[PDB]
Design a binder for this molecule. Structure first.
Ligand SMILES: *[C@@H]1O[C@H](CO)[C@@H](O[C@@H]2O[C@H](CO)[C@@H](O)[C@H](O)[C@H]2NC(C)=O)[C@H](O)[C@H]1NC(C)=O
Ligand SMILES: *[C@@H]1O[C@H](CO)[C@@H](O[C@@H]2O[C@H](CO)[C@@H](O)[C@H](O)[C@H]2NC(C)=O)[C@H](O)[C@H]1NC(C)=O
Ligand SMILES: *[C@@H]1O[C@H](CO)[C@@H](O[C@@H]2O[C@H](CO)[C@@H](O)[C@H](O)[C@H]2NC(C)=O)[C@H](O)[C@H]1NC(C)=O
Ligand SMILES: *[C@@H]1O[C@H](CO)[C@@H](O[C@@H]2O[C@H](CO)[C@@H](O)[C@H](O)[C@H]2NC(C)=O)[C@H](O)[C@H]1NC(C)=O
Ligand SMILES: *[C@@H]1O[C@H](CO)[C@@H](O[C@@H]2O[C@H](CO)[C@@H](O)[C@H](O)[C@H]2NC(C)=O)[C@H](O)[C@H]1NC(C)=O
Ligand SMILES: *[C@@H]1O[C@H](CO)[C@@H](O[C@@H]2O[C@H](CO)[C@@H](O)[C@H](O)[C@H]2NC(C)=O)[C@H](O)[C@H]1NC(C)=O
Ligand SMILES: *[C@@H]1O[C@H](CO)[C@@H](O[C@@H]2O[C@H](CO)[C@@H](O)[C@H](O)[C@H]2NC(C)=O)[C@H](O)[C@H]1NC(C)=O
Ligand SMILES: *[C@@H]1O[C@H](CO)[C@@H](O[C@@H]2O[C@H](CO)[C@@H](O)[C@H](O)[C@H]2NC(C)=O)[C@H](O)[C@H]1NC(C)=O
Ligand SMILES: *[C@@H]1O[C@H](CO)[C@@H](O[C@@H]2O[C@H](CO)[C@@H](O)[C@H](O)[C@H]2NC(C)=O)[C@H](O)[C@H]1NC(C)=O
Ligand SMILES: *[C@@H]1O[C@H](CO)[C@@H](O)[C@H](O)[C@H]1NC(C)=O
Ligand SMILES: *[C@@H]1O[C@H](CO)[C@@H](O)[C@H](O)[C@H]1NC(C)=O
Lengths: 420, 162, 198
């Protein structure tokens, strides 16, 4: 019987709190398909082929394969629009400065590599290397945007999100030094800038180590790219099934049009051909409907990917777990075959510590409440510190505000409040 | 069968007569008179698409044959196929009429060009320089979303029989 | 061409109905496509088979139309759910989601009705007329590092100010809009300046 997870019981008590004293910069990946292969089917070649009398028999049946061509063209233009919406979100091609020094952060793995003739970062090159004819009227149309243009959009988005923060996504691009952008991002998640500026070296080292581990993990696990591999697998196997259905008997005496024509007179040859063409039309209808359903699902996935690109990348999202586990900081996109891969950089607290807390401090018959933090106590003294980090500070009258007397709240404690 | 008979590098076993592909179709054959192995390829086939700038503007059109080399038929060769009736231009513009593999055509006669990604814009980044806006601009944008489609009901008995 | 989507909906439905109607005039391989003609020209023994073929073809066509309608309805329902979300968030409030309610910083939106759809008017705020500045992360003063509470330290070249991020409103650096944290030894890039005290 499967085990849901390890037992855990947090020591909840009436007046105790736990506050982190350290953090851990984490990088996670998320793989999203965007579009599949654009295919177009041919009516006459698939249904029977090169028999003119067969086409004469078919043309009086109706305009079914006209509808099929219409639906497949709709699917193809939908795929192109999906790619356009996901990637074409900036109207300028931003270019990184020639000297790549960002206060210790190392972006060599995700920035484009001029050494490669393909102009791709090592991560997306690994992605391309980690993802893997004869046609009877079954055409495969090429996508409008080649891989190079997609890589160009990815490079532009990366340059914009490194050089100019998130401002380029809401107007003109305004440059800003990277450490200040990262301090802004911490200030977004409720941690003051001094925490960053006193830990810039450690944060940079953790970021570099995390991105290296991500590269290695992608290089190692082959099952990570299932969400992209299965799309190609589904398309290929459906196409192969459709091809196999061509040589099916469908209840006729023979599976070959020419043999039926040669060995049989028109009287029953007409009936056999009618049965065969009806069966093949039914199979083609089934394939087209399957393609439509897959197109709807892929379009939903592409819309989700576009939302992620717009929110996690172009800005900072406060939605929980929308852009990775933990508090979101910023995300980097990466191109992939028939999809896109995100690198969510997230802030994760660690090394918690027990403390004794109180709701308010009674002093001179006045109750002082914390203004931006929480009251703690190492056992003897009382300090006020920010919620997400242990930064003890002497309680004063400028980081607290007074409200009412100290006989109405519950759990108030007695202490003094220094005045500067 | 019908196709293009070509020399085959495939080596049939002495008892082997036909060759078959994954699609279970004939591709390699052995000649009964002289024992040689020949390939069979279907004759060059592809769909036809017509590029038009709109009948209102003009009548000139450029035709694209999908997935055929230009030697098997103002001629241009693309990844999508052989494009005739349009001239290729070293310049670049926005994509007006999509073609495929980064090629788009438009009417100026008919010209085919590689689509332009966007306006290049390098931003000066340095570790002691910041840019602060000194003004603003209130912008108003629109967004159209369909909500409900037309409700229809069918009468099966009268449609089928009447 | 601004209203492409609603026109596409209307045209799609109209052409689907038109194709379904024109499907009646198809022989489906039968010798005729009229009930009365087959009834009058042939006796039941084979007229039955002819009618069977015709009715099977017509039912198959109608079922195909029904499936197409179902798929289009599912897509329209997804779009309508998105529209309801956009209404509830951009209209009945203010959104912090980027580009969800228009390009740029969102302020407020107004809805407008339309045939088989809804049209939004996203009023958005867009900065302009940017100006470069020389900036420092923190200010060292008497061995103490002063950080901005909400602004960022800027300097036109000789004097230093603190100003809000999204607009240029220079202010004199005082001890109330800056908060002290440690000495000026660990911060990288800290500069020297005085901090006025009121
Ligand atoms: C410090 O916190 C830890 C948990 O974060 C406490 O450990 C648990 O405490 C409860 C109540 O004392 C016990 O019932 C549990 O058995 C403890 N856990 C384990 C694994 O033994 C710890 O007691 C706290 N200590 C103080 C002084 O607050
Ligand atoms: C906060 O966490 C970081 C990383 O977990 C700690 O940095 C490590 O410190 C130990 C002890 O000096 C070193 O051996 C490691 O090499 C450090 N790791 C890195 C990545 O530099 C840091 O010491 C912790 N700080 C506190 C106050 O607990
Ligand atoms: C950024 O990361 C790259 C890639 O990991 C580092 O390049 C490595 O440098 C070391 C020492 O110079 C070599 O032994 C490795 O072979 C290099 N990697 C590769 C893939 O060749 C680079 O040093 C890091 N730091 C900077 C500032 O670029
Ligand atoms: C709780 O923290 C306060 C402030 O850090 C401690 O008070 C000072 O602690 C240091 C380090 O032991 C001493 O050198 C000072 O003399 C203490 N000041 C006073 C006024 O006593 C306090 O000791 C801490 N309490 C516990 C239980 O660790
Ligand atoms: C906090 O201090 C106040 C005043 O010093 C305490 O209030 C007194 O409590 C005693 C004990 O019941 C009473 O006899 C006095 O009449 C109270 N005086 C006033 C002015 O209220 C209060 O009990 C202290 N609370 C704690 C938790 O230490
Ligand atoms: C900020 O921009 C607005 C317009 O975007 C400026 O207002 C214009 O100012 C000029 C010069 O006085 C007038 O001729 C225009 O008629 C004004 N426009 C409008 C719509 O009234 C404004 O001056 C700018 N402010 C700064 C400080 O640059
Ligand atoms: C602020 O100053 C910087 C450099 O001092 C400007 O960056 C240069 O701007 C000029 C203006 O046309 C460009 O030609 C240069 O190419 C820019 N430098 C680089 C390295 O690209 C910046 O434009 C200034 N800010 C404003 C708003 O003008
Ligand atoms: C940067 O801004 C400060 C604040 O306005 C400027 O200082 C004033 O400059 C004006 C005009 O030059 C003088 O009339 C004032 O007397 C100055 N005030 C003080 C306190 O010195 C400063 O000149 C600006 N720097 C530059 C390079 O323009
Ligand atoms: C900011 O001020 C401090 C102190 O006023 C300067 O520190 C002095 O730096 C000089 C040059 O290296 C040394 O000779 C002195 O011994 C230092 N004194 C102290 C008390 O630190 C500091 O250099 C100033 N900042 C800059 C950028 O010059
Ligand atoms: C605080 O909670 C404990 C249970 O953990 C309870 O026994 C105690 O009575 C509570 N104190 C107050 C003042 O309610
Ligand atoms: C700032 O960047 C320049 C080159 O762009 C570099 O030489 C210098 O060391 C950097 N200084 C800091 C404090 O980052």
């Amino acid at each position: 019987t499967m085990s849901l997870g390890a037992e855990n019981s947090v020591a909840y008590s009436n007046n105790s709190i736990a506050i982190p004293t350290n953090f851990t910069i984490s990088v996670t990946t998320e793989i999203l398909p965007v579009s599949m292969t654009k295919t177009s089917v041919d009516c006459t070649m698939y249904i029977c082929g090169d028999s003119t009398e067969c086409s004469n028999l078919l043309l009086q049946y109706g305009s079914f394969c006209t509808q099929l061509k219409r639906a497949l063209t709709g699917i193809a233009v939908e795929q192109d629009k999906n790619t356009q919406e996901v990637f074409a979100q900036v109207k300028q091609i931003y270019k990184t400065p020639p000297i790549k020094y960002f206060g210790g952060f190392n972006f060599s793995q995700i920035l484009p590599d001029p050494s490669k003739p393909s102009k791709r970062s090592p991560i997306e090159d690994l992605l391309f290397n980690k993802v893997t004819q004869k046609f009877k009227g079954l055409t495969v149309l090429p996508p409008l945007l080649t891989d190079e243009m997609i890589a160009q959009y990815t490079s532009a988005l990366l340059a914009g999100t490194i050089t100019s923060g998130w401002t380029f996504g809401a107007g003109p691009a305004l440059q800003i030094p990277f450490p200040m952008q990262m301090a802004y991002r911490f200030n977004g998640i409720g941690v003051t800038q001094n925490v960053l500026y006193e830990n810039q070296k450690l944060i940079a080292n953790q970021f570099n180590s995390a991105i290296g581990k991500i590269q290695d993990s992608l290089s190692s696990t082959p099952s990570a790219l299932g969400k992209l591999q299965d799309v190609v697998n589904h398309n290929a196997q459906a196409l192969n099934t459709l091809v196999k259905q061509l040589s099916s008997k469908f209840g006729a005496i023979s599976s070959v049009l020419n043999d039926i024509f040669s060995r049989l007179d028109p009287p029953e040859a007409e009936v056999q051909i009618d049965r065969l063409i009806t069966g093949r039309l039914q199979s083609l209808q089934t394939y087209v409907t399957q393609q439509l359903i897959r197109a709807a699902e892929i379009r939903a996935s592409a819309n989700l990917a576009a939302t992620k690109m717009s929110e996690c990348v172009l800005g900072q999202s406060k939605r929980v777990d929308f852009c990775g586990k933990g508090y979101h900081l910023m995300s980097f996109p990466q191109s992939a075959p028939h999809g896109v891969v995100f690198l969510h950089v997230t802030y994760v607290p660690a090394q918690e510590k027990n403390f004794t807390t109180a709701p308010a401090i009674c002093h001179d018959g006045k109750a002082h409440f914390p203004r931006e933090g929480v009251f703690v106590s190492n056992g003897t003294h009382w300090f006020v510190t920010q919620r997400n980090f242990y930064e003890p500070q002497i309680i004063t009258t400028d980081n607290t505000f007074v409200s009412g007397n100290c006989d109405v709240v519950i759990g108030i404690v007695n202490n003094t409040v220094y005045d500067p | 069968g019908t196709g293009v008979l070509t020399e085959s590098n495939k080596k049939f076993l002495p008892f082997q007569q036909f060759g078959r592909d994954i699609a279970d179709t004939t591709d390699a054959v052995r000649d009964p008179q002289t024992l040689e192995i020949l390939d069979i390829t279907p004759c060059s086939f592809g769909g036809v698409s017509v590029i038009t700038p709109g009948t209102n503007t003009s009548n000139q059109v450029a035709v694209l044959y999908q997935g055929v080399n230009c030697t098997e038929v103002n001629v241009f060769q693309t990844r999508a196929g052989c494009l005739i009736g349009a001239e290729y231009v070293n310049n670049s513009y926005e994509c007006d009429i999509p073609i495929g593999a980064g090629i788009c055509a438009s009417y100026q006669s008919i010209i085919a060009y590689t689509m332009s990604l966007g306006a290049e814009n390098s931003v000066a980044y340095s570790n002691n320089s910041i840019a602060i806006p000194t003004n603003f601009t209130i912008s108003v944008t629109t967004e159209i979303l369909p909500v409900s489609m037309t409700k229809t009901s069918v009468d099966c008995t009268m449609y089928i029989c009447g």
